[PDB]
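Technical appendix A lists one of the benchmark inputs used to test multi-chain prediction within the project. The record comprises six sequence entries:
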Amino acid sequence: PIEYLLFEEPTGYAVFKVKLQQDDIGSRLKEVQEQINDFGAFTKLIELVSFAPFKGAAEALENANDISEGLVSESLKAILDLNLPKASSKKKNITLAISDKNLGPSIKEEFPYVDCISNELAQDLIRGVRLHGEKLFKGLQSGDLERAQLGLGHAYSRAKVKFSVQKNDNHIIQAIALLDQLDKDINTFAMRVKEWYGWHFPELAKLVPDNYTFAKLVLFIKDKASLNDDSLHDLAALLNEDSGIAQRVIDNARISMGQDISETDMENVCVFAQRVASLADYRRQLYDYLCEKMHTVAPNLSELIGEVIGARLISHAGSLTNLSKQAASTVQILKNKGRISRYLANKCSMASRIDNYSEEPSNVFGSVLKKQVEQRLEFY
Amino acid sequence: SADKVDVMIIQAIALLDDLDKELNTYAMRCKEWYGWHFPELAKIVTDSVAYARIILTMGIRSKASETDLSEILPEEIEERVKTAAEVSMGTEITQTDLDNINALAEQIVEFAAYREQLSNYLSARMKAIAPNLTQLVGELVGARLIAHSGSLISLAKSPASTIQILGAEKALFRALKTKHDTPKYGLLYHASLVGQATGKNKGKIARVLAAKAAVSLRYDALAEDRDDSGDIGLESRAKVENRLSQLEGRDLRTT
Amino acid sequence: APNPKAFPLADAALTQQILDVVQQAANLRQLKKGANEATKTLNRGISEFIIMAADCEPIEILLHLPLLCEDKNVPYVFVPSRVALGRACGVSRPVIAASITTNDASAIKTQIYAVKDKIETLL
Amino acid sequence: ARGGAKVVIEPHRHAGVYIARGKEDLLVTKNMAPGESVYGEKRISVEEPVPPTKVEYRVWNPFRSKLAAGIMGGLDELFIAPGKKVLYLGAASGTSVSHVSDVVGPEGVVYAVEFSHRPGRELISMAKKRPNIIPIIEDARHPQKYRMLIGMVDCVFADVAQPDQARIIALNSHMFLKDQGGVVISIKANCIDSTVDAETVFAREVQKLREERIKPLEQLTLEPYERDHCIVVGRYMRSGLK
Amino acid sequence: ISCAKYEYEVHANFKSCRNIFQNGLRFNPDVPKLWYEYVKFELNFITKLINRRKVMGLINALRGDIALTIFDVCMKTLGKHYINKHKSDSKMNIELNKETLNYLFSESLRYIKLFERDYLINHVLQFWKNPELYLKTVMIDITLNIR
RNA sequence: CCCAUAACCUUUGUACCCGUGAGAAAGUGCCGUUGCUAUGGCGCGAUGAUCUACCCAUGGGUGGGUACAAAUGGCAGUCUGACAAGU
């Protein structure tokens, strides 16, 4: 006598009402197990009654967590109070199939008059419901159970392990790869700025040391035909009239016999140089961001060597974890130079281990290893 | 008129290629850097620029669920991304990480805008340098022709067959040397007319197009007093068009 | 409140048993002694079982070894005292983790297997 | 056996497993998250015919997987196909759950189950790289505490070393395994019982399957790769074992 | 609400419509529409009660606190549940704090629009003391004090 | 399109080079605190001791191996040539 059953789902609770029991003594035979599987007989057995869907991902997480330990959440109490009829606590309780013997006494202590059954026959029915899924629901299951299943599994497991940023290092890896690409494109696009500006004007493209400030100079100085002493002092407000480059290349522009190029071409040189300027600035910003994220993630390593070098290692060895797993000699950083390097290798492997497995790690041990290798270098 | 230098054109084509490569790799990095908060967004909206603008608009999945996004999406795609926003398997992210992802996404938008600017520049510039050939074959393929063969003048002096086979030299010299049937489209294959034909008519239209392009080029690189109206391009285009209608009218199979 | 990460240690009885067998292995060259020597052996795959001190300053620099041990089903036990492990291994200095390696030309095979069971029940 | 030497891919008898012929033959499976190898195995790249894209395959090490040992020894029918769901008990890490997700492919799933926490954490990061591996970090003795997260999986692969490995597989396959669904068991006899003969351990464990209503089809000892293991391939029958 | 409507305005069973309402709130403890409607019904009922009192008189601060206790628990539930919506650093924590405050002021200003009357609004502002919004609050305060 | 929008190869520019697991050194020994004795601390190591081509008496000039850049340096030579379609 199994009057109702309670199926908890990735979304919401459902309470089914049984109509025919299956037999009890002959519960094992081939005929009766094949009727668990085949849907004509199962729909003779179970008729859906009620279904309260969960309210959000946060409650579905919380309620799965409560089922996992054993107590009864308020939504489960709500639906049970809606569906069960009020019978005597001594004579003829209302039965209920559940699939968790430990979930028994929590239900029983709330409602005194509900006797929870989980025998072979109840387990049988619950298996049947889980197999026949969503056909039984007459369409009510709003929401895609498959995607709910994925999300709920991930959220519950992530919360059991307390997954977070300070141990997350994939940010360090991606920042490294993107920094290398930025510097590659920056020097390439510097080459092309310098070539267009040189093709009308070779000598600043030979005589400016820094390509970034050259890009500022292209953004300010339009061409060799736009020249004045206020621009001289604006370069002085920029890098150096101390060198006298501004005056000298006024002379060079007065002697520069390159093509006086068209205005539209000058505007596109302008745009491309400005774009390079924005990119290089962005690179510097990301570099500082990388330093800060490292001081969160693996402070001891960073203080032991240097932030960007710790980044190099983490990207090589693949992640912080694999850096920890790595044998302390085969870690490679970049005669007696070889010996100090190998000693430092041992040290930085150990410091990486302490960063990996701690929580909010030990800049004091960053300092300890720092002074130790400093003494060895002092010997060297 | 100093606005005629094939040198700036040919290096412009090279830089256009570089732009395409770098833009794709940066959006790859952004899509998976962010998907580490919102995973299935990439697969649902595969476009780089649309992705970057989504990252500018929203920053948190539920923030997107509240916010309009439909400026840059069709609404069914909007519904998918809103629901997957409601339940991703993804995490939440801290503010500094959203900050630098955000700055990356706007930098992606800026390369897209820069490329469009460069192509508009190039189209106007080709209209200035070789407006007949531009008016015939389309200015992208015209610029690629000039880029490959180098000087506009040397391209003028090539015959018409070699303008047909200006792109496919590897397959050409392999076929010639090993006694095999030489390739037949070449670099013109991306013109709109040969992208308009069907089969053997693609091969035939590439002959007619290469010949009329040689006329157009020679009128452009040598006629010192050019009126810049591209009329030889327009005339010969009308000729090639009419050819295409005749070929595609003909029906190979019985009535 | 939950289990600390040094779990499992050993009782005094298991402690003296293990220190006994690790001494006799060090006599007969079945013992790879020290942190990264234990690590290299757990990468090669040729190690019976792992003995890790829990006294070490800090705990963490050897705490990396339970990952590989549980990756390869090779059992590990914390002994309490690192100078007791130096005691048993018979080298002059505190050894934070030693590892008893596999072999068959071994006068101490079945003694090792007995203690390996005792560990794997303790887990 | 070098960083440049080419090989000729070919497909196996199984579904979703490939062989890389060459001077020496590799058992390989197609990657899902490309570029990034997980446990250092040498992945093999190919080019395939939109302008083309490089696609990439991964070598499967038998000495570090107790499943590719079974394959590379010979199995009549393995129950993992490229469309299915594999419940995976005892998933210590990527070392094999990655490859099972490669041969399950994007349509199916693999529900990796593990109890401890540090391998759990590593499993979570990898699972974020791979969309199929739903990580469950619960004890496997009690399936009832995650009966909401899993539905009706189509094979159960089992890698525990517990001495009650029979009862744990029986619980999980009653709860979840679809009827007539494959069950792949990696017995390690020294762990399951350390005193008796390894054969005796196999007879007892196979027997317990049979009165747990898993008809065992097939049994292999996987000898040159490991000593004393045996994978038993069986079928959950549930309606008349005979 | 449809069920409540049919049992109250057709058959007049205060027990029945009451029980409908407390049950439905146990099922949905985070919908302002339902909270609104329950406060509404209690007002309608007590207005019928008070008119029954004056018509008995013609032929021959407790209820407001009922409504406002409903308001109090309504605010508690709404705050808690819209915290659980969006559920981890200090800046976004404070950001959800102000956003949730914004949400609850929106619906409580709605409650004002629902709205003896000045006594009720007094209890509302008591609830409030228990920046721009501070200004908007106090300009409403002087406006209602005039009113 | 298997990519002449490329690869090779030479040539120029820019870089580097030949696991092991237990040994290492041969009242002061040191510095300083104390007046006419108390001494402050230091005096190795599994939390890693010892091992991984040419000339001019720690120089430069040789020599090849690996990686980044360029080139109007190469491989490397630009298809056919009068008929076709309708009735």
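The first strand of chain A starts at residue 4 and ends at 8. Chain A touches chain C at residues 324-325, 327-329, 346, 349-350, 353-354, 356-358, 362, 365 (CB under 8 Å). Comparable benchmark entries are summarised in Table A2.
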